[PDB]
């Protein structure tokens, strides 16, 4: 369950275990330093078997991992104050208002700010000069009908933007 | 005339208004029948609205 | 951003440490007693509570 | 140089309505809140007579406010 | 009171012989007109109910509902524009025209003489809102839901007519006066029990009870919201205002007879609340919202204490306003969004920002606020089943946790949390929304203030 | 001033102070310094007011009422007999509602004058108080709501022929 | 005494001013939290002097009026008491909350 | 200073006024458990003195 | 104590329990002891109101420490040799009723002993 | 509660603290370098080094995300666009 | 190490210990491979239909409008009455009912006799 | 604006077609559609599902909707009204379940049983009544002023 590939290339899980052995053991030990050779002791366990040429007796012990992984686990890692299920997890979100917005407002108040709006009408150029032709045939053409991946292809061709931009550079700050 | 006629104005309309079920009177009148009542002896609310007297009972 | 160089709330833990020292023997010696005080324990029933808190 | 572009959904029709309704709400209450103060500050409630024999009053004249 | 009849019949051409873009103003103002002449009514006294005419009577129960019939008129004829202003302006004067004309047989069906006149516009009640939800339903299964609705109330209503004719050609004349100071213990026969099964049977699909009840919220989701909003308030609420007329007599065999529709009353307010606490379709959630309510109205009727009455009239008022409110929320989210769904439309704590204190203030009011006259009646009801019997608390508790819970739930699905930043088309709050919740939502809390006027017959 | 005599209120006992403190006294000087701001302009005004209640004089009566026959001496139909019968026992009804309503702040105020003394000076009025809400509960009370005034009647005959037949076969 | 009722009508009648001096305004007050902490300060001084009256002398009292549904053989007004709980429980309270009203100045600074 | 004069010189005012004359004409309304009396005290209305207490020893 | 380990353990026949207190009846030891001095005036009692629960002995000193209390209360710390005599006569009460649960329980241990080894 | 950040500075601390460590020469350490290349470390120190300055810069970046950072330039890149570090 | 971590309708299986993710069929791959597909199918025509400037109101999702309709007005048909559907049916519709219609009956009784004798609390009973 | 087309007009029989259309229109696998099966609950022809949805899909995944965890192409949970974070937390236990309420079960007994130990067999210090001077505290009870003037002293011990 990943974006780009459908397997997900089991070194990568060795390591996902690793980050979250590692994190669980942050949340175990408290005064850094046994924690810091503790780390090292499991960084040295890990490193007892690096070399195996095998793949069966790899993901044996992969197994074996899991197993006393999630029993030597813990109820609350130490997730940070922007993880999610945090402490803040959008803590000030009260803000987020999505700018598909603020040309609903008075125009008094649109004489109140002239340079922000002048300046979002000709983002707003931007974005509809190059619209229809370049990002439309870019989609229509260099993919196959099965589409087969999620990733969006640069606009190398000559000048204007790689499709798809708007909503993903306008988002706000994350922190109003 | 959603308001500035009918919301305020009907409000203190209602807002006073005669003794809706008779409530200042009832209370008037309760004050002068147990006034009345103490000062001439006689225990306040005796039982039996209907008269004792003025009943004819099927005999057994 | 460790920060408490703050007017504010320098004067509101001051003015509650100063209600938190004086106000509870305060208030507590101006009540009127409305039950009777023990005042008659034994041995280890008065020490009891300071005993199991140093413990 | 530091500020940064605030963003609001929007104000004006909110401001609109509510300037609306307290002026509205304000242009009959007033006069009415007067009325009723120079009613109980000159007129007065009543007093609380009893009824002379030999005559017989309104179904009015009974009750305690004035402009009830 | 014809001095209040009489101009109702004229405000009907009104609309006729008014021009375009002036249909409005005159519709409006001389309804408004009509509102200071519906506020003029209470001068109500003491023991007796009062009489206008050689024909008809106010009694103290009428009043309140008419005035709530009265006030709701122009409410609803400034709220059922801008889904119709795109048709044409015959159709709109026909519009106007019916809901006016269903106005005065609502006028006639309070303040009835006699049982038969209330029948006759019981079913005048019924008839033109059919013909409104149907012309205008806007959604595909409107057909089968005026279906169920016609006939599952001139079902129901059917042997109340006969059993009116039976009081009438043994008793004597059925004014309720003459109806009433003659009537006698009618002991237990079984036509005792046929005929006020009968009469509360009309009433209770009326109402409706738990085991009739999808009469009602088809009629609600697929309807439009001027027929809706008179459908909930005033329709249910003056079929428990006719219960409340008729339950005069009959008293000696009605505790014999009167445990099982008890039972289906709470155990379906039991159950309704909790169907409507999961749901999607938003709609339906106000519709047994009714249900749960008028369930509890009906557990407060057939038990016979004056606890029970006046909490009754007051849950019955409270709810008529709370309901009529909530269905003007959920017709502003789909002016909003073309959805009717729940759970897609979300966000809205940013965008139109009062609109969420409306929201608030109407989920506190299904919510029993607790200064509001709906926690006032539902208090009253709850003290006179605990009366009544000493162990029926705990589902009047749970109805009340379970009520609290999905009135909550209501209130933070829809506006709570996140926009969901793919609706990118809608308007800030118009004048006319926040303009209809302000007459929705100033009126209860000042009834919350003096509710002098509220309460029963016995007050 | 109102109906002291219906109103039972007693009279009271306000010790005098002696201080036995050099503070001094913070309450006097504060109540002092609170009748001279406060109390001189509310006493001004309120004389201003009373003068111009004295300009002008308005009245209201007691709308007291005759005395209708009965019920009993109704016959079966006689429906303008039943209609004056049936509306003063209701008025009888709300009156007797408030001279409840006058005992039960009697018993309040007895309840709050003499404070953590509870039986004591309270014990009579309570007892009066249980006489008569007997009274009340023996006559007005487990008939229901869809009463005129006949169900009353009712509950009274079949009271009195249950304890005529109870004395007589326990005499 | 009228000024025991009346000192503790108003330290609850001075917590009502802010509500409606912004449904009011429309053009709202820049010093809003500064406003409400003096006003809340102003309730604590004045909840100081009826504590110390009643310490000082016991006169335990109720205060009720305003009699809405006095319908059946009950009744029930707006009607409030002071009795030692009650009594002087209300300045700690107010103390606190305005010490929190400093705390909630400084703490939602930048939102 | 001007702020508290306003702000608790008004609705002081207000109320003064309104729980003299309204709050007493209303007869049945706020009332007052006493201030205890003591038995070796006088009174400051009526005026008598209490007898006290008797001998107290063997303290 | 030992007192609440020897009645849950051992027997509870000889250890008298509460609210059960008075077992034999007066005067089988007395003799003539009695004087229950309460020249408190209950009526003066009656009428200054102390909370329930506390019209019992001792209460003349509360009486003089209320008293003081309210002729000089902004003296703050000005009533505590009353106070302590207060607080003295409770533990002479307290002691009483100590004495009074152990001469039941002498009496009743060995009376009871006595007669029920050789009887 | 608005702690002010450049780019040069936010570049200049992380390459700092990938000065800080050990098996890395502080000679040859540039801004603009490959991880598994040329500098000497593996995949598993790449996301100890990635574990580091999560826990210093207090927000985690995910293992979806740890396959292709490969270089400190992308590192401050998407620290950067975490941050939106303008004025 | 462990007792094996039991699954259970509350007992969510973590995606660590599947343990079907250790001998994979190339043909599960493929099936994880033609997910993938169906999603990237599915978010490239969302990306179409959503960043259109052109383009004003909502999405029109056809599967949210389909999961609605099968919710509420594809509920009638299909049905037959079955065996578990009659059951269930008389468990939830007349067990509870007839349950609570009992213990009303009795508690009503219980109180109709003890005010039948007359020893009640009828002391003051005023608000019935 | 919309098809009949796009409902699901009765169940999976047969399985040629119910299973195809099911596969081209609710945008699935075919085997990965699970009927449920035409058991006579209603349910058409829907599919069924893991029901898990709220700590499975991990939120680094970042798909569409960031609360709802949809991604706009699914069929949908059946339950899924049930089934969203704030409603019901769906995590995997950190250790067991029966393990929890086990333990929980023996707890609150243990914490109850002593408790009936508690209330059977109480603690005191060993001390006789109050004193209460007036035929114990008489006349201050609820009254009967001269009615039964009640025979109870205190001796001195």
Redesign the interface.
Same mark, same amino acid.
């Given at each position: 369950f990943l974006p780009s590939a459908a397997y997900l290339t089991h070194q990568q899980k060795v390591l996902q275990l690793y980050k979250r052995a590692l994190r669980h053991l942050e949340s175990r030990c408290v005064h850094r330093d046994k924690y810091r050779y503790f780390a090292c002791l499991l960084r040295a366990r890990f490193d007892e078997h690096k070399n195996e040429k095998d793949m069966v007796k790899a993901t044996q012990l992969l197994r074996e991992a899991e197993k006393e992984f999630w029993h030597g686990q813990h109820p609350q890692p130490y997730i940070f104050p922007e993880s999610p299920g945090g402490t803040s997890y959008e803590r000030y979100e009260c803000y987020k208002v999505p700018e598909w917005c603020l040309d609903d407002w008075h125009p008094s108040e649109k004489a109140m700010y002239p340079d922000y709006f002048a300046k979002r009408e000709q983002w707003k150029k931007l974005r509809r000069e190059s619209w229809e032709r370049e990002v439309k045939q870019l989609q229509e053409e260099t993919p196959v009908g099965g589409p087969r991946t999620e990733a969006l292809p640069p606009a190398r061709k000559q000048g204007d933007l790689p499709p798809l931009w708007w909503h993903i550079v306008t988002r706000p700050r994350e922190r109003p | 005339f959603g308001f500035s006629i009918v919301l305020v104005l009907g409000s203190t309309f209602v807002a006073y208004l005669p003794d809706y079920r008779m409530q200042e009177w009832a209370r008037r009148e309760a004050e002068r029948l147990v006034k009345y009542r103490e000062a001439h002896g006689l225990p306040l609310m005796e039982s039996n609205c209907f008269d004792p007297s003025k009943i004819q009972l099927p005999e057994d | 951003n460790i920060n408490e160089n703050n007017p504010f709330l320098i004067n509101s833990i001051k003015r509650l440490l100063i209600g938190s020292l004086f106000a509870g023997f305060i208030i507590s010696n101006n009540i009127p007693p409305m039950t009777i005080p023990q005042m008659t324990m034994p041995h280890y029933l008065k020490m009891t509570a300071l005993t199991v808190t140093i413990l | 140089? &530091?500020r #940064?572009?605030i !963003?609001?959904? +929007?104000? =004006?029709?909110?401001? /609109?309505?509510? &300037? #609306? #309704? /307290?002026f509205? !709400?304000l242009?009959?209450?007033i006069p009415?809140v007067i009325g009723?103060t120079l009613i109980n500050? =000159?007129?007065? @409630?009543? @007093? #609380?007579? %009893? !009824?002379p024999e030999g005559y017989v009053?309104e179904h009015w %004249?009974? =009750?305690?406010?004035?402009? +009830? | 009171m014809l001095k209040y009849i009489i101009p109702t019949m004229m405000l009907m051409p009104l609309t006729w012989l008014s021009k375009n873009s002036m249909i409005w103003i005159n519709t409006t103002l001389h309804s408004l007109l009509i509102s200071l002449t519906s506020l003029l009514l209470l001068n109500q006294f003491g023991d007796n109910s009062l009489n206008f005419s050689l024909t008809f009577f106010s009694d103290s129960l009428s009043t309140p509902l008419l005035i709530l019939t009265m006030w709701l008129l122009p409410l609803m004829l400034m709220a059922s524009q801008h889904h119709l202003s795109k048709e044409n302006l015959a159709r709109k004067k026909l519009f106007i025209s019916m809901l006016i004309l269903l106005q005065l047989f609502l006028i006639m069906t309070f303040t009835a003489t006699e049982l038969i006149f209330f029948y006759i516009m019981f079913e005048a009640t019924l008839v033109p809102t059919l013909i409104i939800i149907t012309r205008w339903g806007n959604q595909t299964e409107r057909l089968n839901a005026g279906l169920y609705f016609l006939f599952y109330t001139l079902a129901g209503s059917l042997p109340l007519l006969v059993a009116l004719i039976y009081i009438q050609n043994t008793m004597g004349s059925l004014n309720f006066l003459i109806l009433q100071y003659w009537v006698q213990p009618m002991p237990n026969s079984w036509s005792n029990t046929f005929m006020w099964l009968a009469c509360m049977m009309a009433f209770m699909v009326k109402m409706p009870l738990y085991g009739l009840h999808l009469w009602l919220p088809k009629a609600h989701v697929e309807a439009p919201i001027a027929g809706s909003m008179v459908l909930a308030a005033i329709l249910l609420k003056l079929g428990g205002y006719g219960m409340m007329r008729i339950t005069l007599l009959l008293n000696p065999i009605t505790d014999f007879m009167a445990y099982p529709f008890i039972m289906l009353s709470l155990w379906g307010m039991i159950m309704t609340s909790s169907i409507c606490l999961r749901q999607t379709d938003l709609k339906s959630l106000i519709a047994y919202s009714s249900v749960s309510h008028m369930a509890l109205v009906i557990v407060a009727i057939l038990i016979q204490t004056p606890w029970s009455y006046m909490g009754a009239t007051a849950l019955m008022i409270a709810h008529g306003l709370t309901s009529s409110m909530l269905f003007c929320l959920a017709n502003s989210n789909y002016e909003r969004v073309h959805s009717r769904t729940m759970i897609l439309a979300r966000g809205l704590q940013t965008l139109l920002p009062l609109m969420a204190a409306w929201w608030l203030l109407a989920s506190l009011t299904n919510l029993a606020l607790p200064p509001s006259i709906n926690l006032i009646g539902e208090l009253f009801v709850v003290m006179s089943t605990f009366s009544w019997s000493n162990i029926t608390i705990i589902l009047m508790g749970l109805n009340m946790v379970i009520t609290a819970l999905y009135s909550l739930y209501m209130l933070i699905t829809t506006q709570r949390g996140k926009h969901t930043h793919h609706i990118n088309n809608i308007l800030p709050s118009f004048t006319r929304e926040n303009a209809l919740m302000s007459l929705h939502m100033l009126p209860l809390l000042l009834l919350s203030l003096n509710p002098k006027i509220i309460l029963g017959p016995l007050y | 001033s109102w109906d002291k005599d219906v109103y039972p209120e007693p009279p009271r006992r306000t010790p005098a102070p002696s201080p036995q403190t050099s503070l001094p006294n913070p309450i006097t000087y504060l109540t002092k310094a609170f009748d001279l701001l406060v109390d001189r302009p509310v006493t001004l005004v309120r004389e201003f007011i009373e003068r111009q209640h004295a300009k002008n004089k308005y009245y209201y009566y007691h709308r007291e009422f005759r005395r209708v026959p009965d019920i009993t001496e109704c016959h079966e139909k006689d429906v303008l007999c039943m209609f004056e019968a049936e509306m003063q026992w209701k008025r009888d009804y709300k009156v007797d509602q408030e001279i409840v309503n006058i005992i039960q702040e009697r018993l309040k105020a007895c309840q709050q004058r003499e404070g953590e003394s509870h039986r004591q000076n309270c014990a009579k009025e309570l007892q009066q108080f249980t006489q008569v809400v007997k009274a009340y509960q023996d006559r007005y009370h487990d008939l229901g709501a869809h009463y005129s005034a006949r169900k009353c009647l009712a509950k009274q005959k079949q009271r009195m022929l249950a304890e005529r037949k109870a004395t007589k076969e326990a005499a | 005494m009228n000024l025991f009722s009346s000192l503790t009508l108003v330290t609850l009648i001075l917590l009502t001013m802010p509500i409606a001096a912004i449904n009011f305004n429309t053009h709202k007050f820049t010093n809003y939290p500064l406003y409400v902490k003096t006003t809340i300060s102003c309730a604590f001084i004045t909840s100081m002097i009826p504590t110390m009256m009643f310490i000082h002398t016991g006169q335990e009292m109720i205060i009720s009026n305003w009699h809405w549904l006095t319908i059946q053989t009950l009744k029930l007004s707006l009607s409030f008491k002071m009795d030692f709980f009650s009594m002087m429980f209300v300045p700690v309270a107010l103390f606190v909350t305005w010490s929190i009203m400093e705390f909630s100045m400084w703490y939602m600074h930048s939102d | 200073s001007i702020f508290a004069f306003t702000h608790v010189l008004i609705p002081v005012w207000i109320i003064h006024y309104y729980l003299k004359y309204h709050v007493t004409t209303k007869p049945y309304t706020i009332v007052e458990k006493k201030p205890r009396i003591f038995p070796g005290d006088t009174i400051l209305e009526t005026g008598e003195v209490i007898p006290p207490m008797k001998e107290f020893p063997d303290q | 104590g030992a007192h609440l380990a020897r009645r849950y353990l051992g027997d509870a026949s000889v250890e008298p329990e509460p609210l059960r207190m008075p077992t034999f009846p007066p005067d089988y030891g007395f003799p003539e002891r009695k004087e229950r001095e309460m020249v408190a005036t209950q009526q003066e009692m009656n009428d200054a109101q102390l909370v329930l629960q506390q019209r019992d002995y001792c209460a003349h000193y509360l009486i003089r420490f209320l008293k003081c209390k309210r002729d000089s209360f902004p003296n703050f710390l000005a009533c505590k040799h009353e106070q302590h005599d207060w607080d003295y006569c409770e533990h002479l009460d307290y002691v009483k009723r100590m004495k009074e649960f152990e001469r039941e329980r002498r009496l009743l241990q060995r009376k009871k002993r006595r007669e029920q080894r050789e009887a | 509660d608005a702690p002010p950040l450049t780019l040069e500075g936010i570049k200049d601390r992380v390459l700092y603290v990938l000065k800080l460590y050990d098996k890395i020469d502080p000679e040859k350490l540039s801004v603009n370098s490959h991880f598994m290349k040329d500098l000497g470390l593996d995949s598993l120190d790449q996301v100890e080094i990635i574990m580091a300055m999560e826990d210093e810069f207090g927000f985690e970046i995910p293992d979806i995300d740890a396959e292709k950072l490969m270089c400190p330039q992308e590192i401050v890149d998407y620290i950067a666009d975490k941050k939106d570090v303008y004025e | 190490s462990f007792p094996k971590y039991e699954p259970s309708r509350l007992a969510s299986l973590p995606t660590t210990l599947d343990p079907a993710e250790y001998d994979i069929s190339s043909e599960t791959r493929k099936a994880q491979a033609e997910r993938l597909a169906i999603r990237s199918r599915l978010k490239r025509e969302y990306q179409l239909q959503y960043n259109d400037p052109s383009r004003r109101g909502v999405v029109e999702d056809p599967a949210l409008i389909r999961w609605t309709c099968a919710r509420s007005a594809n509920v009638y048909p299909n049905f037959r009455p079955n065996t578990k559907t009659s059951l269930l049916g008389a468990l939830f519709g007349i067990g509870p009912l007839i349950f609570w219609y009992y213990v009303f009956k009795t508690d009503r009784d219980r109180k109709e006799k003890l005010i039948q004798e007359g020893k009640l609390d009828r002391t003051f009973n005023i608000s019935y | 604006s919309h098809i009949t087309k796009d409902m699901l007009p009765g169940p999976y029989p047969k399985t040629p077609e119910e299973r195809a259309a099911a596969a081209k229109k609710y945008n699935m696998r075919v085997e990965d559609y699970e009927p449920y099966p035409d058991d006579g609950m209603g349910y058409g022809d829907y599919p069924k599902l893991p029901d898990r949805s709220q700590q499975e899909r991990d939120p680094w995944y970042d798909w569409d909707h960031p609360d709802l965890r949809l991604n706009w192409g699914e069929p949908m949970h059946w339950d899924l009204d049930m089934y969203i974070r704030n409603r019901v937390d769906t995590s995997p236990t950190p250790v067991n379940w029966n393990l929890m309420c086990k333990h929980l079960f023996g707890f609150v007994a243990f914490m109850l049983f002593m408790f009936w130990v508690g209330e059977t067999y109480p603690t005191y210090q060993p001390v006789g009544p109050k004193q209460y001077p007036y035929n114990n505290l008489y006349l201050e009870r609820g009254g009967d002023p001269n009615k039964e003037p009640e025979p109870v002293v205190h001796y001195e011990i």
């Open positions: - | - | - | 140089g &530091k #940064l572009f !963003i609001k959904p +929007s104000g =004006f029709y909110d401001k /609109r309505f509510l &300037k #609306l #309704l /307290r509205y !709400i242009l009959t209450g009415v009723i500050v =000159f007129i007065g @409630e009543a @007093e #609380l007579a %009893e !009824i009053p %004249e009974y =009750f305690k406010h004035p402009i +009830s | - | - | - | - | - | - | - | -």
